[PDB]
Design an enzyme around this catalytic site. Structure first.
Site, PDB file in Angstrom:
ATOM      1  N   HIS A   1      36.753  36.095  49.765  1.00 50.01           N
ATOM      2  CA  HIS A   1      37.713  36.946  50.429  1.00 50.01           C
ATOM      3  C   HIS A   1      38.024  36.436  51.820  1.00 50.01           C
ATOM      4  O   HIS A   1      38.665  37.091  52.592  1.00 50.01           O
ATOM      5  CB  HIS A   1      37.268  38.396  50.445  1.00 50.01           C
ATOM      6  CG  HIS A   1      37.230  39.031  49.096  1.00 50.01           C
ATOM      7  ND1 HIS A   1      36.706  40.223  48.878  1.00 50.01           N
ATOM      8  CD2 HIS A   1      37.690  38.586  47.878  1.00 50.01           C
ATOM      9  CE1 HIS A   1      36.809  40.510  47.604  1.00 50.01           C
ATOM     10  NE2 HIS A   1      37.407  39.509  46.997  1.00 50.01           N
TER      11      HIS A   1
ATOM     12  N   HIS B   1      37.570  36.507  37.246  1.00 51.81           N
ATOM     13  CA  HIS B   1      37.990  37.429  36.223  1.00 51.81           C
ATOM     14  C   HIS B   1      37.799  36.867  34.825  1.00 51.81           C
ATOM     15  O   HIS B   1      37.647  37.616  33.877  1.00 51.81           O
ATOM     16  CB  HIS B   1      39.405  37.938  36.435  1.00 51.81           C
ATOM     17  CG  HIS B   1      39.552  38.956  37.535  1.00 51.81           C
ATOM     18  ND1 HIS B   1      40.588  39.768  37.622  1.00 51.81           N
ATOM     19  CD2 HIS B   1      38.757  39.264  38.587  1.00 51.81           C
ATOM     20  CE1 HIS B   1      40.462  40.532  38.667  1.00 51.81           C
ATOM     21  NE2 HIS B   1      39.346  40.238  39.251  1.00 51.81           N
ATOM     22  N   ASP B   2      37.862  35.555  34.673  1.00 48.58           N
ATOM     23  CA  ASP B   2      37.553  34.973  33.397  1.00 48.58           C
ATOM     24  C   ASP B   2      36.073  35.165  33.043  1.00 48.58           C
ATOM     25  O   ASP B   2      35.760  35.775  32.085  1.00 48.58           O
ATOM     26  CB  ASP B   2      37.904  33.478  33.388  1.00 48.58           C
ATOM     27  CG  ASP B   2      37.731  32.831  32.015  1.00 48.58           C
ATOM     28  OD1 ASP B   2      37.742  33.523  31.063  1.00 48.58           O
ATOM     29  OD2 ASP B   2      37.641  31.645  31.911  1.00 48.58           O
TER      30      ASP B   2
ATOM     31  N   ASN C   1      43.809  43.325  36.665  1.00 45.99           N
ATOM     32  CA  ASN C   1      44.754  42.216  36.574  1.00 45.99           C
ATOM     33  C   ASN C   1      46.236  42.508  36.760  1.00 45.99           C
ATOM     34  O   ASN C   1      46.923  41.750  37.326  1.00 45.99           O
ATOM     35  CB  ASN C   1      44.542  41.461  35.284  1.00 45.99           C
ATOM     36  CG  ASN C   1      43.245  40.752  35.259  1.00 45.99           C
ATOM     37  OD1 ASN C   1      42.833  40.223  36.234  1.00 45.99           O
ATOM     38  ND2 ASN C   1      42.604  40.769  34.157  1.00 45.99           N
TER      39      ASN C   1
ATOM     40  N   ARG D   1      40.169  33.346  41.809  1.00 47.07           N
ATOM     41  CA  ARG D   1      40.044  34.691  41.306  1.00 47.07           C
ATOM     42  C   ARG D   1      40.163  34.754  39.774  1.00 47.07           C
ATOM     43  O   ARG D   1      39.499  35.504  39.155  1.00 47.07           O
ATOM     44  CB  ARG D   1      41.025  35.648  41.952  1.00 47.07           C
ATOM     45  CG  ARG D   1      40.728  37.101  41.708  1.00 47.07           C
ATOM     46  CD  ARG D   1      41.821  38.020  42.206  1.00 47.07           C
ATOM     47  NE  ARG D   1      41.477  39.419  42.126  1.00 47.07           N
ATOM     48  CZ  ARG D   1      42.352  40.366  41.911  1.00 47.07           C
ATOM     49  NH1 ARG D   1      43.602  40.066  41.800  1.00 47.07           N
ATOM     50  NH2 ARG D   1      41.989  41.610  41.868  1.00 47.07           N
TER      51      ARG D   1
HETATM   52  C1  HEM Z   1      32.347  41.579  44.661  1.00 46.15           C
HETATM   53  C2  HEM Z   1      33.186  42.413  44.033  1.00 46.15           C
HETATM   54  C3  HEM Z   1      34.697  42.133  44.100  1.00 46.15           C
HETATM   55  C4  HEM Z   1      35.638  43.067  44.168  1.00 46.15           C
HETATM   56  C5  HEM Z   1      35.357  44.575  44.248  1.00 46.15           C
HETATM   57  C6  HEM Z   1      36.927  42.406  44.235  1.00 46.15           C
HETATM   58  C7  HEM Z   1      38.162  43.015  44.328  1.00 46.15           C
HETATM   59  C8  HEM Z   1      39.339  42.416  44.714  1.00 46.15           C
HETATM   60  C9  HEM Z   1      40.589  43.092  44.996  1.00 46.15           C
HETATM   61  C10 HEM Z   1      40.836  44.620  44.941  1.00 46.15           C
HETATM   62  C11 HEM Z   1      41.490  42.162  45.331  1.00 46.15           C
HETATM   63  C12 HEM Z   1      42.964  42.395  45.728  1.00 46.15           C
HETATM   64  C13 HEM Z   1      43.765  42.656  44.455  1.00 46.15           C
HETATM   65  C14 HEM Z   1      45.188  42.989  44.845  1.00 46.15           C
HETATM   66  O1  HEM Z   1      45.398  43.586  45.932  1.00 46.15           O
HETATM   67  O2  HEM Z   1      46.108  42.638  44.074  1.00 46.15           O
HETATM   68  C15 HEM Z   1      40.848  40.868  45.265  1.00 46.15           C
HETATM   69  C16 HEM Z   1      41.444  39.663  45.539  1.00 46.15           C
HETATM   70  C17 HEM Z   1      40.817  38.441  45.545  1.00 46.15           C
HETATM   71  N1  HEM Z   1      39.557  38.155  45.024  1.00 46.15           N
HETATM   72 FE1  HEM Z   1      38.097  39.619  44.900  1.00 46.15          FE
HETATM   73  N2  HEM Z   1      36.707  41.048  44.155  1.00 46.15           N
HETATM   74  C18 HEM Z   1      35.348  40.839  44.069  1.00 46.15           C
HETATM   75  C19 HEM Z   1      34.726  39.622  43.957  1.00 46.15           C
HETATM   76  C20 HEM Z   1      35.350  38.397  43.992  1.00 46.15           C
HETATM   77  C21 HEM Z   1      34.796  37.115  43.599  1.00 46.15           C
HETATM   78  C22 HEM Z   1      33.384  36.904  43.011  1.00 46.15           C
HETATM   79  C23 HEM Z   1      35.747  36.178  43.806  1.00 46.15           C
HETATM   80  C24 HEM Z   1      35.695  34.645  43.592  1.00 46.15           C
HETATM   81  C25 HEM Z   1      34.548  33.958  43.538  1.00 46.15           C
HETATM   82  C26 HEM Z   1      36.903  36.839  44.368  1.00 46.15           C
HETATM   83  C27 HEM Z   1      38.072  36.220  44.759  1.00 46.15           C
HETATM   84  C28 HEM Z   1      39.232  36.822  45.177  1.00 46.15           C
HETATM   85  C29 HEM Z   1      40.326  36.153  45.849  1.00 46.15           C
HETATM   86  C30 HEM Z   1      40.398  34.665  46.250  1.00 46.15           C
HETATM   87  C31 HEM Z   1      41.379  37.237  46.098  1.00 46.15           C
HETATM   88  C32 HEM Z   1      42.771  37.074  46.743  1.00 46.15           C
HETATM   89  C33 HEM Z   1      43.611  36.658  45.530  1.00 46.15           C
HETATM   90  C34 HEM Z   1      45.040  36.287  45.852  1.00 46.15           C
HETATM   91  O3  HEM Z   1      45.442  36.311  47.045  1.00 46.15           O
HETATM   92  O4  HEM Z   1      45.784  35.965  44.882  1.00 46.15           O
HETATM   93  N3  HEM Z   1      36.629  38.188  44.463  1.00 46.15           N
HETATM   94  N4  HEM Z   1      39.542  41.062  44.881  1.00 46.15           N
HETATM   95 CA   LIG Z   2      36.709  35.488  29.796  1.00 43.57          CA
END
Ligand code: HEM
Ligand SMILES: [Ca+2]
Ligand SMILES: *[C@@H]1O[C@H](CO)[C@@H](O[C@@H]2O[C@H](CO)[C@@H](O[C@@H]3O[C@H](CO)[C@@H](O)[C@H](O[C@H]4O[C@H](CO)[C@@H](O)[C@H](O)[C@@H]4O)[C@@H]3O[C@@H]3OC[C@@H](O)[C@H](O)[C@H]3O)[C@H](O)[C@H]2NC(C)=O)[C@H](O[C@@H]2O[C@@H](C)[C@@H](O)[C@@H](O)[C@@H]2O)[C@H]1NC(C)=O
Ligand SMILES: *[C@@H]1O[C@H](CO)[C@@H](O[C@H]2O[C@H](CO)[C@@H](O[C@@H]3O[C@H](CO)[C@@H](O)[C@H](O[C@@H]4O[C@H](CO)[C@@H](O)[C@H](O)[C@@H]4O)[C@@H]3O[C@@H]3OC[C@@H](O)[C@H](O)[C@H]3O)[C@H](O)[C@H]2NC(C)=O)[C@H](O[C@H]2O[C@@H](C)[C@@H](O)[C@@H](O)[C@@H]2O)[C@H]1NC(C)=O
Ligand SMILES: *[C@@H]1O[C@H](CO)[C@@H](O[C@@H]2O[C@H](CO)[C@@H](OC3O[C@H](CO)[C@@H](O)[C@H](O)[C@@H]3O)[C@H](O)[C@H]2NC(C)=O)[C@H](O[C@@H]2O[C@@H](C)[C@@H](O)[C@@H](O)[C@@H]2O)[C@H]1NC(C)=O
Ligand SMILES: *[C@@H]1O[C@H](CO)[C@@H](O[C@@H]2O[C@H](CO)[C@@H](O[C@H]3O[C@H](CO)[C@@H](O)[C@H](O)[C@@H]3O)[C@H](O)[C@H]2NC(C)=O)[C@H](O[C@@H]2O[C@@H](C)[C@@H](O)[C@@H](O)[C@@H]2O)[C@H]1NC(C)=O
Ligand SMILES: *[C@@H]1O[C@H](CO)[C@@H](O[C@@H]2O[C@H](CO)[C@@H](O[C@H]3O[C@H](CO)[C@@H](O)[C@H](O)[C@@H]3O)[C@H](O)[C@H]2NC(C)=O)[C@H](O[C@H]2O[C@@H](C)[C@@H](O)[C@@H](O)[C@@H]2O)[C@H]1NC(C)=O
Ligand SMILES: *[C@@H]1O[C@H](CO)[C@@H](O[C@@H]2O[C@H](CO)[C@@H](O)[C@H](O)[C@H]2NC(C)=O)[C@H](O)[C@H]1NC(C)=O
Ligand SMILES: CC(=O)N[C@@H]1[C@@H](O)[C@H](O)[C@@H](CO)O[C@H]1O
Ligand SMILES: [Ca+2]
Length: 307
Positions: free
Chosen positions: A170, A43-44, A71, A39
């Site tokens: 996800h 974000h980077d 973040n 993630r």
């Molecule tokens: C497509 C649009 C995306 C949206 C709207 C989104 C949004 C989010 C949100 C809201 C969370 C949970 C944050 C929290 O509850 O603290 C999350 C977690 C996460 N995101 Fe996404 N994200 C997106 C795309 C991506 C992409 C492209 C990646 C990696 C290639 C990614 C990898 C992850 C991972 C692995 C988690 C769990 C992180 C953890 O458990 O520490 N996401 N994301």
């Molecule tokens: Ca950056």
């Protein structure tokens, strides 16, 4: 500016194995770490390119991305990133960029979780600045809707195929109540829960995240296999089990080109894995600093000369 697979061939040939070793260690105490790490790469890349801008801590000169909306109290794993960097610096001092560390760690995290491996492209260089404002605007929000999210991907050169495959990240990791609670009670001002949310899931989430609650609850992005990197994320969607509004929208949005892709990934894990790898490479190629632009940070938290 032509990142390449063999950038460290002369200078730190074993960088990949070393990163992988540390990530594996890390996984020992924290099941979530691989997800958090990938993630950070996402974000980077989405803010001023894959330049390790996210890693920088607050200073007189730096308004940290760590404090940006997407973040703050969400992004994590920064200490593990330091630990990886420390290992590399010990083996190959002054060589491996923090930006590269994030790319390398992403691949390690997926592979270690039962996912595919891919050939990480290298040569990125570390920014001297952060862009908190960019983090607020550039990074997709779970509640902004598929059209806006798709535009945000386009904006960094990633297409619909990229969007669906990358959303597959996800398949592991966690989410806090606040990012999905809009679905739970009064969705989109309707006064009712999001109808695309499987009622079985809805009920548990409702308990987890009570409407006048503090919102401390946390849960799995993938209810099927919360830690394994697999295509279950897509299969979940077919059963209305995607967690984020953004997840489910991929399947439930009438007439979206995304629906067939999800179905394809749901049918063929191998296909998903192959697409995910290519997409990761594509994301990793966003606006790098190269050559002598930027720097190799000694400490990922800080610009050189600041600590
Ligand atoms: C497509 C649009 C995306 C949206 C709207 C989104 C949004 C989010 C949100 C809201 C969370 C949970 C944050 C929290 O509850 O603290 C999350 C977690 C996460 N995101 Fe996404 N994200 C997106 C795309 C991506 C992409 C492209 C990646 C990696 C290639 C990614 C990898 C992850 C991972 C692995 C988690 C769990 C992180 C953890 O458990 O520490 N996401 N994301
Ligand atoms: Ca950056
Ligand atoms: C993956 O990306 C890497 C980074 O771009 C590539 O490696 C870089 O490759 C360049 C060469 O093209 C290396 O450049 C040199 O660096 C040393 C100092 O460290 C200079 O002394 C050297 O300069 C002299 O040679 C020049 C000829 O190339 C002369 O014109 C010049 O007058 C000097 O006599 C040279 O400096 C380069 O000179 C030409 C300029 O255009 C250039 O700006 C300047 O940098 C560079 O050190 C190297 N970087 C790293 C981290 O290794 C990498 O390329 C392959 O691997 C390297 C090691 C070289 O062997 C390359 O020839 C080779 O193609 C590439 N890998 C792939 C598969 O694409
Ligand atoms: C699920 O979310 C929905 C969105 O929040 C919510 O819906 C409605 O939201 C508000 C209700 O608070 C509705 O807005 C109001 O609309 C009427 C008439 O159009 C106004 O008369 C209201 O004015 C109010 O009246 C005084 C003046 O006399 C105002 O000064 C005062 O602010 C007061 O709120 C009110 O108007 C809004 O006022 C403030 C402005 O800044 C706003 O721009 C303006 O809209 C709104 O029309 C309605 N939207 C939709 C899509 O339905 C749901 O609430 C429902 O349950 C109750 C709380 C009740 O409000 C019902 O009318 C709503 O249907 C909410 N549903 C549930 C179950 O929680
Ligand atoms: C990018 O987004 C983040 C997150 O939303 C901004 O930071 C946050 O800004 C709010 C309010 O400006 C701070 O909040 C308070 O919360 C209440 C609002 O409901 C206020 O009424 C009350 O005054 C509180 O003090 C948050 O503390 C803050 N959140 C975090 C994690 O830092 C951020 O805004 C920047 O930082 C702020 C502190 C302000 O200085 C802003 O002017 C500044 O822009 C956003 N950053 C950018 C560049 O847009
Ligand atoms: C499930 O997904 C996987 C991966 O996408 C499919 O296997 C891949 O199928 C592609 C063909 O679309 C195949 O393609 C290339 O490689 C060839 C050389 O090896 C090359 O000549 C060709 O031009 C293609 O670039 C690719 O190799 C293959 N990937 C792997 C890891 O096997 C799979 O396809 C089914 O099996 C393959 C072998 C082929 O027979 C297809 O026609 C089948 O559809 C997908 N399975 C299903 C049921 O769709
Ligand atoms: C609300 O979530 C339910 C639980 O995930 C979901 O039910 C489950 O759906 C799956 C998928 O069909 C069922 O699984 C079998 O078949 C496939 C074969 O490919 C396997 O991958 C599975 O592992 C499993 O063998 C599962 O049995 C089923 N569980 C129960 C208790 O019914 C709900 O899905 C219902 O709606 C459709 C998705 C349809 O599949 C129905 O048959 C299913 O019951 C889900 N409810 C909604 C509206 O999505
Ligand atoms: C390449 O990196 C790997 C991993 O850091 C090195 O192998 C490990 O070496 C340590 C030290 O003896 C062992 O404790 C580990 O069990 C090894 N882990 C793995 C996955 O092999 C390896 O020696 C390095 N190769 C070179 C030339 O430096
Ligand atoms: C789906 C749609 O039409 N618009 C969404 C919505 O969040 C808002 O209209 C806009 C605001 O920036 O972002 C996008
Ligand atoms: Ca999974």
């Amino acid at each position: 500016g032509s990142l390449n697979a063999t950038f460290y061939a002369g200078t730190c040939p074993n960088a990949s194995a070393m990163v992988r070793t540390i990530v594996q260690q890390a996984f020992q105490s924290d099941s979530r770490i691989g997800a958090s790490l990938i993630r950070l790469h996402f974000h980077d890349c989405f803010v001023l390119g894959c330049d390790a801008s996210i890693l920088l801590d607050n200073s007189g000169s730096i308004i940290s991305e760590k404090n940006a909306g997407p973040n703050a109290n969400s992004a994590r794993g920064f200490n593990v990133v330091d630990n990886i960097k420390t290992a590399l610096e010990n083996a190959c001092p002054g060589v491996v960029s923090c930006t590269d560390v994030l790319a390398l760690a992403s691949q390690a995290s997926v592979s270690l979780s039962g996912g595919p491996s891919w050939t990480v492209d290298l040569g990125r260089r570390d920014t001297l600045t952060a862009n908190q404002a960019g983090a607020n605007s550039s990074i997709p929000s779970p509640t902004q809707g598929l059209s806006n999210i798709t535009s945000k991907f386009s904006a960094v050169g990633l297409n619909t195929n990229d969007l669906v495959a990358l959303s597959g990240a996800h398949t592991f990791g966690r989410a806090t109540c606040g990012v999905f609670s809009n679905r739970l009670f009064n969705f989109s001002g309707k006064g009712n829960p999001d109808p695309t949310l499987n009622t079985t899931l809805l009920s548990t989430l409702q308990e987890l995240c009570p409407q006048k609650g503090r919102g401390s609850g946390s849960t799995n992005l993938d209810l099927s296999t919360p830690d394994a990197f697999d295509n279950n994320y897509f299969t979940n969607l077919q059963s209305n089990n995607g967690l984020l509004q953004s997840d489910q929208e991929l399947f439930s949005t009438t007439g979206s080109a995304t629906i067939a892709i999800v179905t394809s990934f749901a049918s063929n894990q191998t296909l998903f894995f192959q697409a995910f790898a290519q997409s990761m490479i594509n994301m990793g190629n966003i606006s790098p600093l190269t050559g002598s632009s930027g720097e190799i940070r000694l400490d990922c938290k800080k610009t050189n000369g600041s600590g």
